[PDB]
Design a protein around this ligand. Sequence first.
Ligand SMILES: NC(=O)C1=CN([C@@H]2O[C@H](COP(=O)(O)OP(=O)(O)OC[C@H]3O[C@@H](n4cnc5c(N)ncnc54)[C@H](O)[C@@H]3O)[C@@H](O)[C@H]2O)C=CC1
Ligand SMILES: Cc1cc2nc3c(=O)[nH]c(=O)nc-3n(C[C@H](O)[C@H](O)[C@H](O)COP(=O)(O)O)c2cc1C
Ligand code: SF4
Ligand code: SF4
Ligand code: SF4
Ligand code: SF4
Ligand code: SF4
Ligand code: FES
Ligand code: FES
Ligand SMILES: [Ca+2]
Lengths: 225, 226, 439, 139, 120, 156
Amino acid sequence: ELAGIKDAAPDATFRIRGQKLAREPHRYSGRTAMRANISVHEPRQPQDIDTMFTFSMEGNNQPTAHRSQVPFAWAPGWNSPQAWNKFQDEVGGKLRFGDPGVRLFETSENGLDYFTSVPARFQPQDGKWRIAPYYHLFGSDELSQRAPVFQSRMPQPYIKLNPADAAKLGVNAGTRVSFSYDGNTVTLPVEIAEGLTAGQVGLPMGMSGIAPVLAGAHLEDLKEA
Amino acid sequence: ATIHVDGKEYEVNGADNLLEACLSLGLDIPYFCWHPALGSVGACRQCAVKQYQNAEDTRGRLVMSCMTPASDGTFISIDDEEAKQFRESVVEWLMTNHPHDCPVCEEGGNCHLQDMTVMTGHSFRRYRFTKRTHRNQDLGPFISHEMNRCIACYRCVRYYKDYAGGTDLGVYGAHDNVYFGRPEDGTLESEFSGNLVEICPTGVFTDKTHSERYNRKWDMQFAPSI
Amino acid sequence: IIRTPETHPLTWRLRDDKQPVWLDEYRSKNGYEGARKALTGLSPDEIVNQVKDAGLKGRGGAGFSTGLKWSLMPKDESMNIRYLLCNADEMEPGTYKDRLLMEQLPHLLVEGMLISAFALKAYRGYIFLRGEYIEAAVNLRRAIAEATEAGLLGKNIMGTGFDFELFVHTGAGRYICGEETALINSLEGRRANPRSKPPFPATSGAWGKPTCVNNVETLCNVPAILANGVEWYQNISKSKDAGTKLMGFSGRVKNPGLWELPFGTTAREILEDYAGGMRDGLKFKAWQPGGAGTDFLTEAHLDLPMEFESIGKAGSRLGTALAMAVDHEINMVSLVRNLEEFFARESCGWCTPCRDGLPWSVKILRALERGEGQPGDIETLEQLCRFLGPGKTFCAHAPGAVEPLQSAIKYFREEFEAGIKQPFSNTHLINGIQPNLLK
Amino acid sequence: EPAWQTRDHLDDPVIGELRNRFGPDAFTVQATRTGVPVVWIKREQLLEVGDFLKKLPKPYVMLFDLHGMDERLRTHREGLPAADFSVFYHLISIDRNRDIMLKVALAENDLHVPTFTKLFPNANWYERETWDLFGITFD
Amino acid sequence: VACNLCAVACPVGCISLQKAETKDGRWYPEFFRINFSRCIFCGLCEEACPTTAIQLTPDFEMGEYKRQDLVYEKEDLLISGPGKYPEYNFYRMAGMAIDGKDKGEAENEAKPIDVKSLLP
Amino acid sequence: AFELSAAEREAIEHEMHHYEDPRAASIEALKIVQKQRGWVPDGAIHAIADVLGIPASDVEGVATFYSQIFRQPVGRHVIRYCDSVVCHINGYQGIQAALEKKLNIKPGQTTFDGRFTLLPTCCLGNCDKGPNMMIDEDTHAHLTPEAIPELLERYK
Ligand SMILES: NC(=O)C1=CN([C@@H]2O[C@H](COP(=O)(O)OP(=O)(O)OC[C@H]3O[C@@H](n4cnc5c(N)ncnc54)[C@H](O)[C@@H]3O)[C@@H](O)[C@H]2O)C=CC1
Ligand SMILES: Cc1cc2nc3c(=O)[nH]c(=O)nc-3n(C[C@H](O)[C@H](O)[C@H](O)COP(=O)(O)O)c2cc1C
Ligand code: SF4
Ligand code: SF4
Ligand code: SF4
Ligand code: SF4
Ligand code: SF4
Ligand code: FES
Ligand code: FES
Ligand SMILES: [Ca+2]
């Protein structure tokens, strides 16, 4: 069932009229000086035995080459991102000689039946707080939050509460509420979410110490601390 | 539909405008405001071609190739002297107020305006007066903002509003004092604001993360990835 | 000057003390009878056909046929939401006809808008009126309220079964708002950038609905046609452009003013019989027929009839037929400089050639006015006039901007050549680099 | 009229003699900015064309150049015969003060040309250089 | 201004530099190295410099014992004067705001007109 | 620190009643705020965007596009003198010089007390009685430079 990944891209023996595909443009600069601090002898350029590309400009990057994997767009007289107009059969449509990547499976001849197990209406249990996931674009990815440029962009971790439940707890926005999940009494400042339904606590997934596995879980011991 | 460019017969798609009809065949027309995904608004007036309705027509008319449909039986000329002179004049008019900022610009060698300045063969400056300047806004950690380099091609407002659905980028100003940005300073809160670094033909909206550790396009080693 | 109802079908009902005419006084002197005949004895289609047979050209400045424009609305009955717009902006310099048309006879405009809304079956009408006309705005609101009270605006007008609502939209003072598509854009609360044509406003105009934009003088012309007939309107003057136009000379003349004259009256008659000629100690150098966006003409063109085709044959335009006289004391370079400053500071800023080439002409004329002109500026102005003609720019503001510049280049080239005193110097000597010297 | 314009060169008398000798369907004429009549000639008639140019009344007694060319990546080959490789022979007639460039088209697999050493003895090193740098074999 | 034009105009490729930016906003090379064992003294880097920063001075006595010592760094190319072009500054022409240079203070540039200005 | 009053909000809503789009009342909303406050401050843009529902960038573009929608503070009275072609033939430059000599400022600047804001404007539509000058709601025709000091004393 993973047999389609052979057709995702051609092998390392694929050549455009005998030559490989270039990873860097034809006017790449400083070949004989970018490593001269370490040693004045420029070594052999690395060889890519795995794929059809090469770590050099001795390769084919013409817009009319019979290939689908395009490292970058460049045409003579077209240096902008608008140089992609030369790499397509029609401008704005599909890529010339087909787009890369193939679907693993086709549509089945017949489908599934009706899923009968309907759920029950959400009744808020006292004490236990259902965790509502609040995904953010900057912060819910495992690796993107490690970027130092996202730390100046991601919002502060706020636990989101209904106005009714926050008034019941007596907490106002800005104050810290401590919650315990598996022996971790972690404090978060409170934001008020009118659109959130009563009986839930809004938590941002993928943050520091708040995993996406927390979605749908309960939360006992939600007190102001 | 069938069109005629400089006496050459081309089979085109008749539901399309003439600009990408010619761009599909590999025919070079300078253009700024048109984008394949956004559409045509006829703003930059750079895509002028001389249209003839008969096979024997001397005068013709300078029409917008992004605004004229590629119907069956249009005889357009791109490399005509009148059309080339008008396109060079439009490039010159865009170059009257442009700053002397190409070495210190993050899109040097990646600039659409550079390609269309060299494409029309304009290299002599007879404009001798002052150039208008604009202040800059702090658009957040991602987008570096330099409004002096703008040419008022309206691509940013079109994409950000009519395509991305964002509400904080707009067009303000006057006759020649046109500004493109926010009503104040602050982060662009759209989740698709990053495409402004490639939608903008000039170096107004640039990648600040790339601008931290900056190298030119020919210095880049690229790869296709997911 | 006396104005009978026959040869002055619009200006016969003003007051000698220059006061507005209200509903009782307007209705006393045969008012709202063309509207009565239109709403009671004629279908909308035959009203449109009557206006088309009358040969009523639009008095906005282009002279397009109003009946044919009304015939371009979609004939499908699924689009019952329709708009009629009255372009009361009149932001062109040298134009003052609309101010007199609505400050003293607002009910004439209201009646004409009623007739034109019934002809198009337009459910709503807006007067896109400029912000500076304040007394005109007060008179328009008073006239609308008075006509609404006495069964002429609102629901079931006269008992025919046609419902029409009229509004006054006061503009915020931009010259480009007078253009019909830009008028539609500013009516919808957006920036006043003009739209591409086609699609013309008659099919997809205001809020995507069928919408017809007309000048004030056309809507003031229509009720005389609907009351006194079509063949009577064709029997006012023996000219191809039928009707009466509000003409008049302005600018350093003896008696500047506004007079309703038939088409075909020569421009010397307006200067002499009405304006009285030049003032004391003044001579005549040039004139400009249709406001600021028209080519200058000379003394030899003074004995020329004031029609669209006659002025259009002699390298100019009729425009609004409100002529401006330029004397010999006025320097033409500074005059064209002021015209270009107005045309460049009032540009909408959408498209490249006007926006980034009109200030270049402004700066060149600033250098010529101070005598700091350099060799190659007049050729630059000529190529600028060539490349800012019709079809190059998105709208028609820039061809009208460059018409006086090319006319002053053509007729008064010796005044423009007198502003060049210093040699051409664009670069400066960089120490250490020998410059290139083209020959 | 500038000297750098693409001149197709049908006004050369040598083109007329070649049309009258080998017929109107034996070779193709290329319009270039070289200032040279460029004649694409079939491989079988290369020796016949060489002998014909050697035995003209004011003949081409000079083999100026002889070298190959890789046409596998040339995208703009409009007006040109289909070819993966090519070999050009640049010949000069001194008395005519004229010169011609004869190009023969070769496929990627059938890379053998008849030799030019017998007509011009200085073709030996040029054919060796063409074989060394392009892999084209000379029979 | 670390614009990398000399590195790409070099036919040998013996110039290596990386752009750095100070707190004001002006550009400079973080490092600038030339492999003089590779350079052919063709003068294309001086020809392609838009700021007239890199210059080939008339000095030839550059004999060395180890060719690793022939790799000159930024501390060895930067001199204490203007060189062959004495009175040219690129930032007096550029439209980028730097220290001591507000918008509109460049050559042939006007003061910035705000969009909120009352003048039509 | 901005907050729309009752009268401005009710007038804004009544202007929304006139059209089929709340966007179309943006120009009259800005004119209402300009009439009440003398000009349109920074918080008024966001308040109008809140009451109409359109983005604040659209309100900013509309406000900065039009000349008589003031985005900077003005004086007690705004003088708008015509500078177009017919008044240039009629000599508007004498009136401009008279106003510059009296108010001791430039066109576009305000006096230190905040009395008059002198501004050029386009054609006033009264070219047969040129030159003209439009103070806040009053137009003046057949102007002479000597009548400028007598004209400016009617606005304290
Ligand atoms: N204040 C004033 O009175 C001013 C008047 N003008 C006049 O405005 C003119 C330019 O007007 P524009 O609207 O830009 O151009 P235009 O002349 O093409 O259009 C004018 C009218 O003709 C109609 N029209 C023309 N061809 C049509 C077609 N094929 N289908 C449907 N409708 C058609 C338009 O709908 C519009 O109502 C100038 O020539 C000048 O005379 C210019 C400036 C100021
Ligand atoms: C820049 C520009 C400004 C215009 N200003 C006005 C105007 O102020 N008043 C007007 O009636 N027409 C004006 N027009 C003409 C309009 O396009 C159009 O003719 C008008 O809305 C209706 O004209 P009509 O009476 O022939 O139907 C202007 C046109 C342009 C290009
Ligand atoms: S945007 Fe383009 S033309 Fe403008 S300064 Fe940058 S590189 Fe130069
Ligand atoms: S900022 Fe860029 S995208 Fe926007 S109008 Fe200017 S040049 Fe076009
Ligand atoms: S010519 Fe272009 S920029 Fe000028 S007013 Fe018309 S659309 Fe606007
Ligand atoms: S002079 Fe040397 S460093 Fe400069 S471009 Fe030539 S080879 Fe490169
Ligand atoms: S030395 Fe000159 S060409 Fe090289 S990066 Fe610096 S400014 Fe650019
Ligand atoms: S690309 Fe056609 S006008 Fe801009
Ligand atoms: S030109 Fe001044 S009022 Fe018209
Ligand atoms: Ca690998």
